[PDB]
Nucleic acid binder design. Sequence first.
DNA 1: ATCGGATGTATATATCTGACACGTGCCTGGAGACTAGGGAGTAATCCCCTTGGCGGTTAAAACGCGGGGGACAGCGCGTACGTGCGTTTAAGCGGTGCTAGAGCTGTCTACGACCAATTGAGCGGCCTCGGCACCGGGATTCTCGA
DNA 2: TCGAGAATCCCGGTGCCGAGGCCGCTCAATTGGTCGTAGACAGCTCTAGCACCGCTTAAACGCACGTACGCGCTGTCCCCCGCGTTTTAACCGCCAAGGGGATTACTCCCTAGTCTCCAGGCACGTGTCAGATATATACATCCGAT
Lengths: 95, 97, 79, 82, 43, 96, 95, 106, 105
Amino acid sequence: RYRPGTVALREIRRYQKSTELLIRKLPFQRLVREIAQDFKTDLRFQSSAVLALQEASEAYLVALFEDTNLCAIHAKRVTILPKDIQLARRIRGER
Amino acid sequence: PHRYRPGTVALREIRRYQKSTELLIRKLPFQRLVREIAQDFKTDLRFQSSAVLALQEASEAYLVALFEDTNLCAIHAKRVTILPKDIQLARRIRGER
Amino acid sequence: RDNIQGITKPAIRRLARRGGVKRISGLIYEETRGVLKVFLENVIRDAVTYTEHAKRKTVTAMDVVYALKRQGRTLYGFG
Amino acid sequence: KVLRDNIQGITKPAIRRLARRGGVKRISGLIYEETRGVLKVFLENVIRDAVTYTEHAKRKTVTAMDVVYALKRQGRTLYGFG
Amino acid sequence: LPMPMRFRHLKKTSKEAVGVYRSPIHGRGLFCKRNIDAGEMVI
Amino acid sequence: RRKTRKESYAIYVYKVLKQVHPDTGISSKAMSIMNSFVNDVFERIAGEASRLAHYNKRSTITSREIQTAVRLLLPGELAKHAVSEGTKAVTCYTSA
Amino acid sequence: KTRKESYAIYVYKVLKQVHPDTGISSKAMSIMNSFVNDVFERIAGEASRLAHYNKRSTITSREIQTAVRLLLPGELAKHAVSEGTKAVTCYTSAK
Amino acid sequence: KTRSSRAGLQFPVGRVHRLLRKGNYAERVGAGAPVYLAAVLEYLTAEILELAGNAARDNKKTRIIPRHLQLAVRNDEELNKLLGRVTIAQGGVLPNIQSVLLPKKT
Amino acid sequence: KAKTRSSRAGLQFPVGRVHRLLRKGNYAERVGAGAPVYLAAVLEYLTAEILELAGNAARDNKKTRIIPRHLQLAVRNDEELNKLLGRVTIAQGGVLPNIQSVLLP
DNA sequence: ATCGGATGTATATATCTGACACGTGCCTGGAGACTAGGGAGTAATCCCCTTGGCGGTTAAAACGCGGGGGACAGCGCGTACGTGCGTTTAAGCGGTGCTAGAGCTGTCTACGACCAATTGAGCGGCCTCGGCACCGGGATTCTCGA
DNA sequence: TCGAGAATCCCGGTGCCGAGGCCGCTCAATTGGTCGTAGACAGCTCTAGCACCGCTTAAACGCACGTACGCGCTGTCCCCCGCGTTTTAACCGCCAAGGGGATTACTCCCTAGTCTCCAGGCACGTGTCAGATATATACATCCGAT
């Protein structure tokens, strides 16, 4: 309820125990369809294939977040900021 | 000369060095060091002058890169001094913890 | 079209929870969407290259893993 | 032999000059030891792969081409030795 | 870290952090050659 | 239409699991992930050994080169355990 | 004393074609040899693995096309594929 | 007559030899290569599956879900050194919270 | 017994030895005829572009010879070659001059 | 803010030396001719499935408010470092002898590819039964304001 | 230091589809020779990494010190979030289809392989000049004076 910051810990632990995906199927599928149509038209996707991409995304993405996390800790603060994301992206060696 | 302000000659030193092309660590100490460290894995080995030379440059390369990275994160720390914790930060964030 | 807004606030919030953060700024979503879009386009470029080289207008799952492996990541459990 | 000496073979001005080529000015006095540590832990892997390579070839000398071969095995490539 | 699976640390990584020596308070004691901080399961 | 026959490392790893823990079931997804893992490590080691063999002007692939490859690739004492186990297997195989 | 292989004359002629005024030192020779070799193994291995992907026993030109499109960055890939197609067409027309 | 039982291993050896022969890794191979590869694959598979079973009996579930494999691979350190840049489908992530982000009061 | 294949296609890099390397490099079992020609073509293109950048750098520095510093400056200052050569070092090298804005007084 | 003075910065002038570019030899690869035989493509196909679409809803998202907790700007401070200089010292060429080792060559013998057929390991179809999901409720533990 | 309320864990209690195991029917893995050969052994040649010392000085050593700033503390104020609400299309489960992905069969033609000769590219001398080296100088900059 009240005391902001308490509910965040409960939510983060509950979700850390869980191991499901985090993106709704249809919006992500439509986005992949659009970005494919950008490259070539009338491409038939395998329902297994899309799923594939999906998982990889979160993997990559979550790793990035964690890095930004420790970067914020290096700056004597808790909240993460956009600037830290560019920090991680540049320092990783993938710009 | 006179007692100059800190960092003033540092800038001209940077300018002289960053354009330069040479070897910064001496030759004899490094070859002695590698011959010393080679003993543990296997004793009584012979080195080639061309070989060891190569090695130092590669090491320097890697080491130079590290400073680059550290410098940037140091600027992210809202300070100009370099501190140990930033070296560990760079080492861990690079991907070889 | 405009579907980048499809990845909405609660989903990225939950994935931030995956990351290990509780305090996040309200002006971080746009560059996250940009980074995600860059990753997807970079992967799907190799994906469509693979799928069209074999003269099949469909896209399978095993070539996706193949492109992921060529890029530098690796995926397990799919093919 | 194993000797604690020659580890400080990279005296302070060498690291000073390396930092300058990096482009930094203010370095604290307690950086030198961890620089030595990271240099040693890096050099361990390359020298170990080099000695394994030269051992497998039934000779007890190391060339430079096998060294760049090991370096490429790790991922950092050298140009200019063949 | 969940509770049940921490059994391993009891039997394998629990034989170096503490030594057995002459206590100064009374009789014999379990002295220390290692360091363990707060909220750490020990014995 | 026309049924096809495919090869997967399904039976052997299942037999290994039964040999180790003859009381625990396995899932199909775990089966596929283990198949992918074994294919991955097999290809990694084989390719590295082959390119090493080319590196030495040798037209053959002996058994020694593979143990050199597993010395390079495998880190820590796991390398010692694996190489000792391989030597055991080959020695127990030859005189038969 | 013995016979050893290198790329010295060909890179020298290529240099003289575009800048018939500038000399180079042996270090430039060694580094250019290393560069051309490195790219050769990279592209050749990629082509071999592509050929093995589709259970095909041969490596033809279009395999090299796919490999070069997949590996090199965009604009340089376009230039390279154009020049290579020109070369192969002029070779096949006048055999 | 079979060939796997000659060394007492479990992974096939004829299959490995055929697949390595048609894999064009080289032109000519010795006799100890297939048995040696079967042995090392055996050892690695046993190493992983023992921890898989331990994690299975952790939650008191007979079937091994991929989450158990993810936990067993990640919690070990040598595996994390060897499986550096690899993910797992449906794998999830091991629990972790940063130390300095832990509120407390009297 | 004349008119080498490189001359036949009007190239310079030796197609015969490239084809030999593909044959004996154990990359496949059947090699197409056009593959070595095409590889020689792309190698010529890449070498020509990198050497032209090196010559431009030499013109800037008014040096009649080329040392690795010139070509390193040529490679680094180009974005595309930098992206292609992500993980690379050069013997007797150096670093392009740069200073952070905040670091300056 | 403005100007003078010490001082490192990049430039022009002899010169000289060892590495750069060129001319020779010929032997090992590559191009010219020919063959056959095994991969390949191209016609045809037909069932798996992926696209498309429709009813119901509720789990999930979207939007507004209240505030407290954390980002951010500043100020002293005292302290750790960069600058400077006199001194010792091991690096850096210099040049010498040689054995230990790498490297090339004739050899000939144990060892891997070819192949024919077998025939049991091994892959696919069908119940099926219990490990596990779904659900309903009581027992169990945490937290923050009086 | 102590309650009220609020969450999670567990004990049933029940119903269902996925891992499993048996039967049937293949196809490629041995076994045994068979045949050619790649590398292993011993010898000889050459050449250079190493042990060794001399002499010279660029640079490391270490002290002196005067201040630039990393840090602790303060105050500030502003916006992220949690709680509540209304709002809605992702998701579920159901329909139907056509098309194209994977498979069969086939003739044909690209190429591995052999033999063939000749020519061009690396080892090897040999002449020669591009830029390092040391000298004198106009110039831009840190510092200090107002």
